[PDB]
């Protein structure tokens, strides 16, 4: 079963998650409408390409870690 969807404003950024060059791909996250590549680990934790080495429990946590990483900057889209 996929995680539930989410939508919030976190640190002034709109982050959204939903069940759905890189993998295929069962959950999508967006930061101000730009898709962020995320991945689920076998133990059920999540990462994103901007915080890839530091697992967090949920896709919302990965989206929040990406907003923290970006420090206000726009995200660039990923290839594909």
């Amino acid at each position: 079963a996929a995680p539930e969807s989410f939508d919030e404003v976190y640190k002034g950024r709109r982050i959204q998650g939903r069940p759905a060059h890189e993998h295929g791909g069962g959950y999508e996250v967006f930061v101000d409408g730009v898709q962020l590549h995320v991945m689920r680990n076998a133990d059920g934790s999540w990462i994103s390409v901007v915080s890839h080495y530091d697992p967090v429990p949920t896709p919302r946590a990965a989206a929040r870690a990406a907003v923290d990483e970006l420090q206000g900057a726009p995200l660039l889209p990923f290839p594909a």
Binding site: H21, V50, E69, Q71
Partner: protein, 276 residues
């Protein structure tokens, strides 16, 4: 070709390494290593095809990726070899690695921007082009997201593990490869990425030249594991879906197998490697 501990380089060697890295950047060759790396970071998955990461071929794949990069550096200056960063020994922000004559230091506190050394954005010589965070300057926050680098005792505890890797051959595995990579256990290689911060915490981590020195030391720890366990070898050894077996070729090269990369001495030696 002798790969030396970064802490031991002479000033001439540091100068020549930096100049060769900056020339690969200027000529456009550097950024394609960054792009290839992020494509495998985004494609290697626990439940699908996995080659560069979270899989037994993490070690031979990075060994060949580093050889490709070292060969590129030697095409600019044939005297240069990849140094390695023993982060269990040189573990503070005061290490000479982080001095302005080598890699420069930590990022300033507001935006993570590296302000000194040859790769600081202000030099005009180190644009961050292949990126996900849209900012175009090198960033680091040494020790910001995790308190300490691994210690020698922690490295020794991973080097003692006898099985190279174990089913299910992914981030959930027990065994040496996944403890070195760091998805399980005390965490060696992943934690170093997190400790440097900035681009090193992302799939475009080769944007920071320290990437190569970190992986040259991870590669040395594989060589040390083999000397500690001469009776143990790469697994799996055939017919495993989605995992690169010993004699299977590896993307993106397709012309090399883990079996061709197990013995590093076909390509380089280390300044010191204790023997078994």
């Amino acid at each position: 070709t002798v790969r030396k501990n970064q802490a031991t380089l002479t000033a001439d060697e540091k100068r020549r390494f930096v100049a060769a890295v900056l020339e690969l950047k200027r000529s456009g060759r550097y950024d394609e290593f960054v792009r290839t790396h992020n494509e495998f970071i985004m494609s290697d998955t626990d439940s699908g095809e996995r080659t560069g990461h979270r899989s037994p071929s993490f070690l031979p794949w990075h060994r060949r990726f580093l050889l490709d990069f070292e060969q590129a550096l030697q095409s600019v200056d044939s005297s240069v070899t990849l140094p390695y960063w023993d982060w269990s020994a040189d573990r503070t922000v005061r290490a000479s690695l982080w001095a302005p004559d080598f890699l420069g230091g930590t990022g300033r506190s507001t935006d993570g921007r590296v302000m000194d050394g040859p790769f600081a954005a202000s030099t005009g010589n180190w644009p961050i082009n292949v990126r996900v965070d849209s900012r175009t300057y090198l960033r680091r926050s040494l020790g910001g997201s995790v308190a300490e680098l691994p210690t020698r005792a922690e490295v020794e505890s991973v080097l003692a593990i006898s099985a190279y890797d174990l089913p299910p051959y992914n981030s959930a595995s027990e065994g040496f490869r996944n403890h070195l990579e760091g998805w399980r256990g005390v965490n060696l290689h992943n934690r170093v990425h997190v400790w440097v911060g900035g681009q090193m915490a992302t799939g475009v981590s080769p944007n920071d030249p320290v990437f190569w020195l970190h992986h040259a030391y991870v590669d040395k720890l594989w060589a040390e594991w083999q000397r500690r366990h001469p009776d143990s070898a790469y697994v799996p050894t055939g017919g495993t879906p989605d995992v690169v077996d010993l004699n299977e070729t590896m993307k993106p090269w397709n012309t090399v197998r883990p079996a061709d990369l197990l013995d590093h001495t076909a390509y380089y030696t280390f300044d010191a490697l204790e023997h078994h």
